[PDB]
Design a protein around this ligand. Structure first.
Ligand SMILES: *[C@@H]1O[C@H](CO)[C@@H](O)[C@H](O)[C@H]1NC(C)=O
Ligand SMILES: *[C@@H]1O[C@H](CO)[C@@H](O)[C@H](O)[C@H]1NC(C)=O
Lengths: 50, 49
């Protein structure tokens, strides 16, 4: 009850954090590890697991 | 109103849900006014004013 104190909203909302996580997930599923070291190179998932 | 010989409400620590002791008794809420700080967004003096 506003007793001289307040909370500030986080700069990134929950929706944007979820979007970041989903982007990381899609990158690590459809592009293996190379998407974190330059351009994202597609590769079939069984070959990535190999 | 809630009970005769005890009427001054307070929910957690300081809300004090009563004026002090109205002769009409009975209580609604407590929120006269409540406001916070300010901040200024500036792009830089050497860029604009
Ligand atoms: C006057 O006192 C009586 C108490 O029963 C009640 O009507 C009220 O609390 C007070 N004010 C008015 C306008 O009657
Ligand atoms: C502001 O911008 C101008 C033009 O880009 C630059 O010359 C100057 O060093 C900058 N800083 C200040 C404090 O003026």
């Amino acid at each position: 009850k506003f007793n001289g104190l307040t909370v500030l909203p986080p700069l990134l909302t929950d929706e944007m954090i979820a979007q970041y996580t989903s982007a990381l997930l899609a990158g690590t599923i459809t592009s293996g590890w190379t998407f974190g070291a330059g351009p994202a190179l597609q590769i079939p998932f069984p070959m990535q697991m190999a | 109103k809630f009970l005769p010989f005890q009427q001054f409400g307070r929910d957690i620590a300081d809300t004090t849900d009563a004026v002090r002791d109205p002769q009409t008794l009975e209580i609604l809420d407590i929120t006269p006014c409540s406001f916070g700080g300010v901040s200024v967004i500036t792009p830089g003096t050497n860029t604009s004013n």
